[PDB]
Design a binder for this molecule. Structure first.
Ligand SMILES: Nc1ncnc2c1ncn2[C@@H]1O[C@H](COP(=O)(O)OP(=O)(O)O)[C@@H](O)[C@H]1O
Ligand SMILES: Nc1ncnc2c1ncn2[C@@H]1O[C@H](COP(=O)(O)OP(=O)(O)O)[C@@H](O)[C@H]1O
Ligand SMILES: Nc1ncnc2c1ncn2[C@@H]1O[C@H](COP(=O)(O)OP(=O)(O)O)[C@@H](O)[C@H]1O
Ligand SMILES: [Mg+2]
Ligand SMILES: [Mg+2]
Ligand SMILES: [Mg+2]
Lengths: 26, 441, 433, 426, 64
């Protein structure tokens, strides 16, 4: 099971910009 | 541009086949001593012997220290060169023997030179590569990681072992800011960038420009360390919140007599490393002037120390005749050095000067001090040097120049040197004043 | 293997150079002449190697540049490694943080070794497979590996610390690995592929390792909790007597039962003529201990004043210490012996000499000291090399002789130019006119 | 075996009447000195006096140190015996008088009895307050523990299934190792396994461990705590020894007196031996003079080989054996006499037979004549080179040729001085 | 940078809306904020009415 994409790549994407930056990206 | 009793000495003024020119490298006269020091310099550059000792002797103001400084200059800044006065060995914290051994080891140097392969640049993109699992399984399997790097004039994408993933995870690499990776050892180092520096309103993250040239880089790094640095680093601790660090910070760690075991371990590891061709050994020079101030115990320990197999070359300066060695009252020796140590080293004589040599010395020193003097005062200065002393004439130059500048002149004349004679005295006239006065003078 | 070294003063000698029945050959192993002293040194070496006699002090006396230091170096070289040999000077005892008796005790204890053998198991081979399972946000991990030899091939599953031990040093499928079960220590012998042959034989093996340590180190370790650091920083002050008293008995029981074996060594004291009378009395008392090594002291003084007193004694030592000591005397060198010494010294420094140059060097080492010509050899070679001919001739030797002065010539120059230098009363004349 | 200038002396060799036999216990001659030493030994065994001070005076190579060692060996391992030289009192971090008093306290001993409570076994649970569910091979019990011992437990990285061993008196904690029950958890598990301890979890033992007064004085003078980090850093804060106030000594005396009064301990005074007292200076002599007139001081024996010499630290104060007259007045002097030819021969024979060597009669007589002509210690020390020289020729018995060759190879003090005087270069 | 009389404006998720005003005698302007900037700001809290200083050297914001 993979809840959202490759989970390792998922956390990589999260640390690309940050949690708040991820929220405000859209 | 500040001058102090030196800096007009640039080498020994030697020549191929080891013959010293009469006037070269700020040197005049002293041909034999310069030739001997050149032979010593060649022996140093051979880097084969160990613990060779020479003592250069002569009267005061005869260029005894200038010779050692000249050989240090000729040897080059690469080789270590440790200067020392004989009175520095008496330390309150540690015994004189350990201080002597520390200064003895500080003269030996080690050059570490090695190459590194680097991929450094700005991240273009990064992506795992899904592939079939090697074993039976139901899930994504990453067999490679593709990372693209762009720098000035260069761009390249690379496929890498996926296990390095944690290196990105720990490094908080992000995308497009920076990257700098080593080739073989793996791992990644995060060195933001000027491309997005002005994009944000304000940010507490530093920015570096695009790396220059091809992403792939060959770098050769060379450094030099004295063995004393290795010993003191091995003995002294390091770290953060450990109890030993707190103890060291709270104790003012004065010097301690480093044990022989640590020195032997350092020697063994250094020998192993130079066996691999990554390191090179460079014996240096230990210069000690005014050795007459050394105690007999230090001389006795020097006798044993000179016979070690990692000893540097020690040069000694002294200006004493038949004198009693310090620490004793019945041994009278030449140069204040015990005969047993004298038997272990090579003597280098040093002769006084002639009036013409003194005149040339004064002219050169005046030229190096940005002053203009004609012969009508240069002859008087030479006569003063021959009458009072050479060093007195050397010192009198600057007051003469200041007096000339006061009178809105440019050239030093006889009147200026006479006025400087009247104002400042030498030792002989001071003693004559002292003897003829009976007012506690 | 060979440690860091250069061409030292006594680098040309390796052992005493004796026969099977302690008969010294005229020239062997870098030692020339002095047959009586060499045979006495061989007898003392046999005494040390037997390991039964304890606390024997032997004094080597002779004029300077005779061979006592060379004799001690040859004894140390012939004794070989694994036998302690602590060489110190007479002035090293004085210290600002340790008393003279404490430093002497440490020097005495530094030259007795203790060897403890232990048996270790190993499993060595080439890694065939490794599966590792990390539970994210979980506290436990699941490991397994498959390891083979040329005959065996077996799988293992690992606990907790095995996984981290394997992960700090990256272990891959192309590696050769050795594992110690007791310590769990990783050892990488090389990557077979992807320059070392595949390990052969049984998957596991047994071996023995010896830990050798000085008695002084054992003494230092148990003194204080931080005393271990003093093994390197050298900052330990006045270890209490009860520690040594208990450690001696503990070593005695260890030897009696059979866990460890002790090896006595040799303590060499150079320039022993300078030492306080307190140190001499302490040595007099401490020579009688059962845990005392053979002490070899070197001296070159005649009837001289012993430090810390006001009376003169032979060799600079009190008669009390001289009473319980054995004296070996060294004699001056013949001209042929001087020539042979110069020849072997020149051969050590890979310097080619001409026969007439060698004869002139022998003559100048007969008139002056031997060390003078021995030193002159290298500078003569340097001059010859600068002249572009790789052979030392008489002209280069004479150039070196005139360029670099001798003690006698320097003394004569000082005596005839007394006014130039600073005398004992501080009066000098720098002005030429 | 190993020999060093001794170990052939096994006691004073006295009988019940106290009369010294001519040859007994590795001793020949020295009858009067041996009898006096036996009297002093009996006086020490009486355990009544305090501060008695004797010195034995004689020339070199007369057996003073041998007499002191024989006294110590005859007293027995139970009684403490502190040997010392005059040069040890010059320390670096403390004054000389403080070091002398430290040795004085070290000289006497105290034998005490104590009860030690011990817990051990497998650990079933570990819940913070700490509660430990110990379980032995027969019993199970839960214990409540202090935060400090809990910290020591944590630093031991203990877990469920680890047989451990706690001591109640000191709080010392040692993890014995993983229990044998979980012996199948990893095929290459590095952890060792131990069977569960036998008996109940709580045990009590009675021990008769000895101590010295200086030991329990330095116990509260400066600590050596153990496994606690706070104690470690506290003992690391001060690394140097210091002078002890007399108040601590008085409190120690009061505690020890209470202990011995309670019928739990007994006091055994010891001996303090000082060889080469001539190295002491006037200040140490005065302080020792003051400290001898105390109520706890042990028996002190002094050794010296001096004539009428000047006391160190003074200019013109001359005295016999280099000891101030005031300290001499409160001293008991034991004379020591030189030896004769037959005594020297017998001593040489004893030293040969202890070193498992065979010496023929003619060689023994030559050695005795040499010892009379040069010295006794030289003849004693020349035995081993003779043995090795005999061995090299593939023999077992020392021959006249061997002693002659040993004479040729090695020189004594007289010939060394003769060759020193008649030579040009020093 | 001095004169941080701000009256901050921070309300997505994880403390979004990273903006704050800056006023002085002759200047007045609104600055947007980054993740690290607000992470630094939350420590050493600014009451939004206190003159505060901050450097552009990517260092630490100093209370005045
Ligand atoms: N040949 C020379 N060339 C240049 N300067 C010299 C020469 N000889 C002596 N000097 C001068 O003499 C001074 C050195 O004095 P020195 O002889 O070293 O004193 P000491 O011998 O007491 O150490 C220097 O300031 C240097 O300028
Ligand atoms: N028998 C020998 N064989 C080789 N070299 C010797 C011999 N005797 C003396 N030497 C040399 O003479 C020099 C002086 O050493 P030595 O006489 O042992 O010390 P010291 O001068 O303190 O007596 C040494 O460099 C040593 O190499
Ligand atoms: N009665 C004796 N029997 C055997 N050996 C003795 C006797 N007396 C003295 N010795 C030996 O003489 C040596 C010197 O004795 P010691 O007391 O240590 O020094 P000193 O006698 O000079 O004070 C010792 O090694 C001891 O073995
Ligand atoms: Mg100078
Ligand atoms: Mg020597
Ligand atoms: Mg004695």
């Amino acid at each position: 099971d993979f809840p959202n994409a490759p989970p390792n790549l998922k956390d990589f994407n999260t640390n690309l910009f940050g949690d708040r930056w991820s929220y405000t990206n859209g | 541009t500040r001058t102090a009793a030196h800096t007009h000495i640039k080498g020994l003024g030697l020549d191929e086949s080891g013959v010293a020119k009469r006037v070269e490298g700020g040197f005049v006269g002293q041909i034999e001593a310069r030739e001997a020091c050149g032979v010593i310099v060649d022996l140093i550059k051979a880097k084969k012997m160990s613990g060779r000792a020479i003592l250069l002797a002569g009267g005061p103001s005869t260029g005894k220290t200038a010779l050692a400084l000249a050989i240090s200059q000729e040897l080059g800044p690469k080789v270590p060169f440790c200067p020392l006065v004989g009175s520095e060995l008496y330390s309150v914290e540690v015994k004189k023997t350990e201080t002597l051994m520390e200064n003895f080891r500080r003269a030996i140097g080690l050059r570490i030179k090695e190459t590194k392969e680097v991929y450094e640049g700005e991240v273009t993109e990064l992506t795992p590569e899904d592939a079939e699992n090697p074993l039976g399984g139901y899930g994504k399997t990453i067999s490679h990681v593709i990372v693209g790097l762009k720098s000035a004039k260069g761009t390249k994408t690379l496929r890498l072992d996926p296990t390095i993933y944690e290196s990105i995870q720990r490094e908080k690499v992000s995308i497009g800011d920076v990257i700098y990776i080593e080739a073989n050892t793996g791992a990644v180092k995060r060195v933001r960038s000027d491309a997005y520096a002005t994009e944000f309103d304000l940010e507490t993250e530093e920015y570096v420009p695009l790396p220059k040239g091809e992403v792939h880089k060959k770098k050769e790094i060379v450094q030099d360390v004295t063995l004393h640095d290795l010993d003191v680093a091995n003995a002294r601790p390091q770290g953060g919140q450990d109890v030993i660090s707190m103890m060291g910070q709270l104790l003012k760690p004065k010097k301690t007599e480093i044990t022989e075991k640590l020195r032997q371990e350092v020697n063994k590891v250094v020998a192993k490393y130079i066996d691999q061709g990554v390191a090179e050994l460079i014996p240096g020079v230990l210069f000690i002037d005014e050795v007459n101030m050394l105690d007999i115990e230090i001389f006795t320990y020097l006798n044993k120390a000179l016979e070690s197999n990692i000893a540097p070359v020690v040069v000694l300066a002294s200006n004493r005749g038949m004198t009693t060695v310090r620490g004793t009252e019945d041994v009278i020796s030449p140069h204040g050095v015990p005969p047993d140590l004298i038997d272990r080293l090579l003597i280098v004589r040093t002769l006084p000067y002639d009036k013409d040599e003194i005149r040339t010395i004064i002219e050169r020193r005046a030229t190096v001090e940005r002053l203009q003097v004609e012969s009508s005062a240069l002859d008087l200065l030479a006569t003063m040097g021959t009458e009072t002393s050479l060093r007195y004439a050397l010192q009198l130059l600057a007051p003469c120049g200041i007096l000339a500048q006061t009178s809105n002149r440019k050239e030093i004349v006889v009147n200026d040197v006479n006025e400087a004679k009247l104002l400042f005295l030498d030792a002989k006239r001071s003693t004559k004043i002292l003897e003829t006065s009976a007012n506690y003078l | 293997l060979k440690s860091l070294s250069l061409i030292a003063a006594h680098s040309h000698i390796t052992g005493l150079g004796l026969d099977e029945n302690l008969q010294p050959r005229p020239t062997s192993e870098g030692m020339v002449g002095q047959l009586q002293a060499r045979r006495a040194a061989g007898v003392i070496l046999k005494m040390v190697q037997n390991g039964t006699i304890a606390g024997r002090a032997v004094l080597v006396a002779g004029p300077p540049s005779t061979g006592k230091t060379a004799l001690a170096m040859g004894v140390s070289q012939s004794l070989g490694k694994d036998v302690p040999f602590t060489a110190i000077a007479g002035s090293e005892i004085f210290s600002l943080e340790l008393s003279k008796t404490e430093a002497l005790t440490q020097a005495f204890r530094k030259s007795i070794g203790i060897k403890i053998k232990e048996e270790t198991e190993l499993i060595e081979g080439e890694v065939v497979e490794i599966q590792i399972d990390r539970s994210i946000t979980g506290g436990h991990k699941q490991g397994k590996l498959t390891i083979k030899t040329t005959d065996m091939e077996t799988i293992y599953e690992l606990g907790n610390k095995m996984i981290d031990g394997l992960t700090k040093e990256k272990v891959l499928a192309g590696d050769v690995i050795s594992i110690d079960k007791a310590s769990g220590k990783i050892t990488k012998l090389g990557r077979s592929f992807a320059f070392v042959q595949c390990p052969e034989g049984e998957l596991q093996k047994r071996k023995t390792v010896v830990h050798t340590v000085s008695l002084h180190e054992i003494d230092v370790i148990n003194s204080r909790t931080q005393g271990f650091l003093a093994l390197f920083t050298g900052d330990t002050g006045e270890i209490r007597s009860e520690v040594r008293d208990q450690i001696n008995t503990k070593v005695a029981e260890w030897k009696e039962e059979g866990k460890a074996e002790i090896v006595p060594g040799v303590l060499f004291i150079d320039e022993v003529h300078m030492l306080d009378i307190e140190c001499f009395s302490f040595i007099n008392r401490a020579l009688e201990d059962e845990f005392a090594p053979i002490v070899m002291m070197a001296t070159n003084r005649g009837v001289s004043k012993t430090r810390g007193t006001n009376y003169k004694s032979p060799h600079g030592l009190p008669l009390d210490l001289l009473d319980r000591s054995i004296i070996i005397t060294t004699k001056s060198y013949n001209e042929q012996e001087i020539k042979t010494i110069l020849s072997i010294r020149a051969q050590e420094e890979e310097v080619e000499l001409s026969s007439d140059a060698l004869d002139l060097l022998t003559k100048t080492g007969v008139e002056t000291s031997l060390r003078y010509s021995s030193n002159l050899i290298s500078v003569a070679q340097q001059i010859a090399m600068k002249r572009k001919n790789n052979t030392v001739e008489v002209e280069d030797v004479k150039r070196a002789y005139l360029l670099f002065l001798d003690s006698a010539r320097s003394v004569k120059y000082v005596q005839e130019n007394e006014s130039q230098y600073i005398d004992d009363q501080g009066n000098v004349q720098i002005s030429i006119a």
